[PDB]
Amino acid sequence: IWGVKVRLGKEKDVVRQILKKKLAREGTKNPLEIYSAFQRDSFKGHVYIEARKAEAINDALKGNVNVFSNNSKFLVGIVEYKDLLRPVKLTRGSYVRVKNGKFKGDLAQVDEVLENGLEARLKLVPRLDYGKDLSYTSKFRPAQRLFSEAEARVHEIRRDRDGFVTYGGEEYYEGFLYKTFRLQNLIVNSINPTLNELSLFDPTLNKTVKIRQGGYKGKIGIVKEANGDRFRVELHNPNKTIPIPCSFLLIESTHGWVPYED
Amino acid sequence: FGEMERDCMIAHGAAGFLKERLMEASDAFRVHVCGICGLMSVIANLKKNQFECRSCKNKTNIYQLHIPYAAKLLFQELMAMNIAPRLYTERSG
Amino acid sequence: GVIAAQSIGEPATQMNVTLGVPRLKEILNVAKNIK
Amino acid sequence: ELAILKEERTTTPYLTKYERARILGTRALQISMNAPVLVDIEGETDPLQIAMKELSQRKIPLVIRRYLPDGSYEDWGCDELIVD
Amino acid sequence: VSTSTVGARRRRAKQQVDDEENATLLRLGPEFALKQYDHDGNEHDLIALSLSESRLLIREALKARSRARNGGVIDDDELAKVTSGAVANGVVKKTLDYLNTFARFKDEETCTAVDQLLHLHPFEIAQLSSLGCEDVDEAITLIPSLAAKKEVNLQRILDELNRLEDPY
Amino acid sequence: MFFLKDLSLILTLHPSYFGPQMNQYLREKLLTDVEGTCTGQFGYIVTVLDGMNIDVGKGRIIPGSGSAEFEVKYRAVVWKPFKGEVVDAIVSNVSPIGFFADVGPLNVFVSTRLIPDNLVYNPSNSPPAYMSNDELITKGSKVRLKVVGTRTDVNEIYAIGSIKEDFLGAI
Amino acid sequence: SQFPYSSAPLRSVKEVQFGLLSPEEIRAISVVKIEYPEIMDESRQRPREGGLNDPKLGSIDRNFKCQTCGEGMAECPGHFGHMELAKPVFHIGFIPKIKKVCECICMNCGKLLLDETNPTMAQAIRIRDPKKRFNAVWQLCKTKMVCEADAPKVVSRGGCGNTQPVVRKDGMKLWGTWKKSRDAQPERKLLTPGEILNVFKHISPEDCFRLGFNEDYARPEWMIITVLPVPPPQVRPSIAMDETTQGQDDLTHKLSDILKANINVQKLEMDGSPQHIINEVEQLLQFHVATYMDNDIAGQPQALQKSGRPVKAIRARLKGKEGRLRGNLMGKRVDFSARTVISGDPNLELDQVGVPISIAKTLSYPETVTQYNIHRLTEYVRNGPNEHPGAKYVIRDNGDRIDLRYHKRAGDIVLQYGWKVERHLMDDDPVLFNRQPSLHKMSMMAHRVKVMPYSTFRLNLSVTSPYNADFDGDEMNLHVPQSEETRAELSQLCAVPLQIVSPQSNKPVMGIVQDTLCGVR
Amino acid sequence: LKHGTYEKLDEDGLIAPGVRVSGDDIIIGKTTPIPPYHTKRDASTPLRSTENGIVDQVLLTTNQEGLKFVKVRMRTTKVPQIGDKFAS
Amino acid sequence: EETVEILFEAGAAAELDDCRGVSENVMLGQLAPMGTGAFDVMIDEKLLTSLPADYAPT
RNA sequence: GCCUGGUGUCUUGGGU
DNA sequence: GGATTACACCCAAGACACCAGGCACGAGA
DNA sequence: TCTCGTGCCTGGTGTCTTTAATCC
Ligand SMILES: [Mg+2]
Ligand SMILES: [Zn+2]
Ligand SMILES: [Zn+2]
Ligand SMILES: [Zn+2]
């Protein structure tokens, strides 16, 4: 058995291509003298090929666009063969982490599994809004909080049993969502409970002004700053903001420019 | 304030001015060092008034320095590459 | 020291044997094979 | 140990331009922090001006510690160094 | 904050466990080495003080300073009021009163007699004066370092200490 | 355990204190800051020797701040206790967990598992005491204990004693 | 003064001791162990403990205090973590020196191949400089091609008798070719970091010194990396590209790659390892740790970001015009500076500079309040930041600044001695004036300010020559000293009249020029 | 929020032609919501700090992706003064 | 020049930098031993004693 | 009722 | 047969991950 | 009402072969 380096993600394709070549050449004068070929997911970027002569390995891969042209094949020891073909949990009452949907990343208890053996019913702390803005994603979801049936009663619900309600077509029993997930959609290994899981389980600014005394008499402006007695008017006419005393200003109101009786 | 302006102040001999420009008028920073191991490993809670370099088990022989922030940054980048820059405040020969 | 460095460098910035900047470069670079 | 006795002092008896600048600035700084001034202050009230007045009358109460290359040093008072 | 003549103490390759203070093993730490240096660099033996020496120096220093505070003008409770602050008042009063109830030779006449009698590691010489003993058997038990020295006089030490000792 | 130690203190002086009695101010300043204070490195500093005659040296002016730095070298009476040292004491308190004894500045705690069985705490007696027949441990009774451990808080140090050994106890 | 009071004594730096950080020390200063490459808890706010933004490493956010020192983000320096490596790897910087050490020592017990009995070698240990001594030793021992079990009776030197290999570098891998005992077949096997690591710990203290290393500061097995120090977030801050979208620093992404790669080395040794897979995964951990420190390794392709451009390694952070040393330490950007086009004025004194009013209201000088100027300074405070001559801040001895733009009760301030008033720039204040390129010392001279209308800097015409300035578009820079000490340094050392004669050619550098010189003839 | 004035914006979030503007004034108001009331963050555009003038014309349209799209042109007049550059 | 190489080599051979150069002190932001920094300034306690007594520190 | 944050890395075109 | 060296400062305008797989919603039968 | 197809969003992961001088 030789290993061969191939383009990442193209290992299954190379195994396929080798099979087509083998079957197409069976019984001809130039058979492909390989016995088998395979690719292990755990071993990214490699295909393994079974044969008697190295030349057959080169023959199997000739012209394959997914294989690195460098003469990189390597020999496997007989004592390493079976480990290449090693094929490899989940119990009711145990915890898993959800891998998809608004509950992605959340800890859940395994309640039960389907007869066929694919999806598992999970007990989950819900993330609900009680229909508050109706007329969901994992990035725009809700905080987790146990289902409250009286809140649902008040705001937006079918009773099914003691402590069991169907609310918006999902089932909540004693405050928890019970929802089926594909087993492939949950993580059962190396779960690390989090901290949180251990805990749980002046009236004239900006108004337009006219100046009635001084060298700037008759000009429009806006009150930029009115700290005290001395105002800052941003004059319109030249690009300058001036310091000015409060006796000098007329303010606009409902009827004309009004003195300091506004 | 580039490299060539630095040289001009040396030529004038205006050492005091050059120090101030590059510290008080810029990125001056205060750090604490351990008097034993010379590293900036001191954990300083100023409202509790308690200091400790955990490595040396030392709560008494501790100094403060005024250095540029960009120099503090430089030493932390050197630490991240396993280089130890030990700042001591006294000579020995 | 610094005064010496500036006093020599500044005239160079405004300036059959080799002369001028290429000759100056040979000296500081103490080249084993001069031109 | 490192200190050199008064009779055996060898460095120059004139105040250098660098020593002068440092003395004026340091003394100016102390006056602006309300150190007791040793001369009469008339009309000239800037911190630098008062310090320059004290220098001209040989009344600045500071000592120069001039370090020599080996680390030893001669202490010279600004009262005894000759200022041009 | 406050520091001493002894400095640096930079890191060495081999550690040391002769540092932990143990009076039995003569380990007084890095500050109280056998040979110290004063503020001029001169060599000097470690100054360990018996209860009798210490009572004279501290009391003298306080009354000379008190006289100096008075421009140049006995009881322990009066001598402790010279300090400044109630924190300082406490530690000084408690130290005199403690010494007032455990210093055998409470005057300079007897003390100088004890001084000349005692004046060989400097720490052991100071220990023998502080801890009163009756016989040779009592000294080498409580102070087990005097065992393998093979130089007694111990008995005449204790006899003179007990004879100079006033009744109570 | 009493020693004489040559110490020094860095003092920073604001420029407004630059007057003709500068040294006398510093002498008062040194004493106020150092007398009665404790450090784990030296112990309790009881009294400073020759305070009115201390030579303060010359003050270094700090560049950029104007303030002056003095290194005041001095000599003091210091008190630090030591592990292994046998000492006498005066009991301050008696409790079910042992007793507390004032040895000058500080207090030493001796726990019950290091006290001999025949010394029995007697509250009914007047006044309360640890009693025997020819032994009498009331407040002010000379007792002889041995310091078996020193813990450092750098502000006040704490030492634990024992009377679980030969010749230690009341005398 | 901008620093809150601390009882620790203030001192300056007298010595910098360089060295290596031991594995033990890295753990002693670390405040957390780093294991998980997922930065966020689960994208629901608050970053994950044990992750790369664990809050014990520090705060780069104005509202979360450091859980280690209690200080705000301004004062908090940041605290290091550590990352345990499943297998020891080489430090990319030290490989050529490691290679040199192999030819010096025995590859079994680690003893120096020569003794003081060799006369030339006894001369070489006397060389005082550690680097030259180490090289002189290696220059001798290089030709010694076998580690002798016996001294050169049988006197043993502690040797093991093995012949030594010729070690060669091939990228990040070292190959050693041993000559097994004419010619036969030699088998060169790979010299892994772990193999070399054990050999180095058995080197004696006496041979450690003779190799120019140092028992306390640079112990030779510390050139192999077993635990990686995790720098705090101050070294690798996040930036927000378009406000609510933030990308991570190159180091943050690269540390994630090292951390992921570290977990897969743990994932191998417990189950399915087809050996030839262990070598591909371990070499990849070596790769990521190498390009994390230096991504300019000659002879191999650079690590790339997904954008296609090369990763900014730590080595590249320090070198070149814009790096930490030439760009932030030998020179840097500074406060209290200004710049504009210059114009000439014959009716200004030689040592004056005309300063535009708008510039004069932005720059400031912190003048200390004393008995002689307190009445004068109160007048400036009433005028405020917008009327000249005025003032911008009042600074108390504690450091709190009062911003006079927003203080509506400005009339109710009474100044205490010792406070500071940051007043506007005013007539006869000295300032440092400067035109780039600063070719010689008279490119920076101190002038006396004269405040004037219009927006150019004014120079008396006779100073154009030392600056090599003219008025065809040139700009010049002005710097304002910020304390009493530096004002005096400027006026007494750098001032224009002191600079009239230059030491370059013992002659003046300023004279009468252009119109005035034409006219005076 | 930015430190400048918002009082020149109309209700449509856009300033109108004819209004004089100075530096740091907001002329286009825009917000972005904060992910998980009091939910948005300012993303407005202020006038460049060194400039002034009059808003001349405001274009409103949509881009290729269908979202709203604005342009604000500001005009001012520059009068020769000390320091300005000229050449034959 | 050779910025990073110098520093790696400096680490591996435990170099001691005695901080006497101008460049050392400039980049650490400390007063450099040059010009106005080439000496220390001390307070003349002897000359202060010629002042009158009402100027005295209490 | 004090505090108060708006990016980076390049490339290209320019000024002296 | 290898890298390292190659003036200084400043202004301003002009830009931004890809592919594959899985899940959900809508439309048609 | 159920099934299939298409579109959108989220997560994970690269690859057909295609400027010149100097010194150590
Ligand atoms: Mg020009
Ligand atoms: Zn330490
Ligand atoms: Zn912190
Ligand atoms: Zn060997």
GROMACS .gro file of N, CA and C in nm, chain H residues 9 11 15 22-23 25-26 29-30 34 36 41-42 44-45 47 51 62 64 67-68 71 75 78 81 85 87:
model
   81
 1343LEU      N    1  -3.006   6.968   0.946
 1343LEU     CA    2  -3.071   6.861   0.872
 1343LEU      C    3  -3.222   6.879   0.869
 1345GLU      N    4  -3.601   6.680   0.789
 1345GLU     CA    5  -3.659   6.554   0.834
 1345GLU      C    6  -3.622   6.434   0.746
 1349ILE      N    7  -2.946   6.771   0.423
 1349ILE     CA    8  -2.947   6.915   0.435
 1349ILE      C    9  -2.997   6.976   0.304
 1356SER      N   10  -2.034   7.517   0.831
 1356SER     CA   11  -1.899   7.528   0.882
 1356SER      C   12  -1.853   7.389   0.923
 1357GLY      N   13  -1.723   7.378   0.950
 1357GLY     CA   14  -1.661   7.253   0.993
 1357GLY      C   15  -1.727   7.178   1.106
 1359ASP      N   16  -2.006   7.038   1.126
 1359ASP     CA   17  -2.150   7.025   1.108
 1359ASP      C   18  -2.186   6.897   1.034
 1360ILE      N   19  -2.291   6.830   1.080
 1360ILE     CA   20  -2.342   6.713   1.011
 1360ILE      C   21  -2.426   6.756   0.892
 1363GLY      N   22  -2.724   6.268   0.783
 1363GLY     CA   23  -2.749   6.184   0.899
 1363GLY      C   24  -2.781   6.041   0.861
 1364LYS      N   25  -2.707   5.948   0.920
 1364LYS     CA   26  -2.731   5.808   0.894
 1364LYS      C   27  -2.700   5.729   1.020
 1368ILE      N   28  -2.748   4.851   1.636
 1368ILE     CA   29  -2.654   4.771   1.714
 1368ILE      C   30  -2.714   4.632   1.729
 1370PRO      N   31  -2.800   4.260   1.894
 1370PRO     CA   32  -2.816   4.217   2.034
 1370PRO      C   33  -2.713   4.112   2.074
 1375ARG      N   34  -2.654   5.323   1.623
 1375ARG     CA   35  -2.525   5.390   1.628
 1375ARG      C   36  -2.512   5.488   1.513
 1376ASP      N   37  -2.456   5.604   1.541
 1376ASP     CA   38  -2.444   5.708   1.441
 1376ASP      C   39  -2.338   5.672   1.338
 1378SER      N   40  -2.288   5.914   1.065
 1378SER     CA   41  -2.313   6.034   0.988
 1378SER      C   42  -2.182   6.092   0.935
 1379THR      N   43  -2.195   6.183   0.839
 1379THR     CA   44  -2.079   6.241   0.773
 1379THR      C   45  -2.069   6.388   0.807
 1381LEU      N   46  -1.892   6.767   0.764
 1381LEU     CA   47  -1.807   6.852   0.682
 1381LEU      C   48  -1.664   6.854   0.736
 1385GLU      N   49  -1.303   7.357   0.647
 1385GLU     CA   50  -1.375   7.415   0.534
 1385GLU      C   51  -1.503   7.483   0.579
 1396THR      N   52  -3.086   5.607  -0.628
 1396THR     CA   53  -3.050   5.475  -0.579
 1396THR      C   54  -2.937   5.418  -0.663
 1398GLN      N   55  -2.696   5.061  -0.789
 1398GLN     CA   56  -2.721   4.935  -0.858
 1398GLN      C   57  -2.786   4.830  -0.768
 1401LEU      N   58  -3.043   5.037  -0.284
 1401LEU     CA   59  -3.052   5.118  -0.164
 1401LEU      C   60  -3.033   5.266  -0.195
 1402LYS      N   61  -3.069   5.351  -0.098
 1402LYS     CA   62  -3.066   5.494  -0.120
 1402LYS      C   63  -2.924   5.546  -0.127
 1405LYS      N   64  -2.560   6.246  -0.287
 1405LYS     CA   65  -2.440   6.328  -0.302
 1405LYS      C   66  -2.471   6.472  -0.267
 1409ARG      N   67  -2.014   7.447  -0.237
 1409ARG     CA   68  -1.937   7.549  -0.308
 1409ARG      C   69  -1.892   7.656  -0.210
 1412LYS      N   70  -1.285   8.121  -0.307
 1412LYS     CA   71  -1.151   8.144  -0.256
 1412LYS      C   72  -1.098   8.273  -0.315
 1415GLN      N   73  -0.495   8.576  -0.127
 1415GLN     CA   74  -0.450   8.639  -0.005
 1415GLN      C   75  -0.304   8.603   0.010
 1419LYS      N   76  -0.029   8.106  -0.419
 1419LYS     CA   77   0.079   8.082  -0.515
 1419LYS      C   78   0.035   8.118  -0.656
 1421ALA      N   79   0.207   8.197  -1.084
 1421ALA     CA   80   0.320   8.174  -1.171
 1421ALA      C   81   0.287   8.226  -1.309
   0.00000   0.00000   0.00000
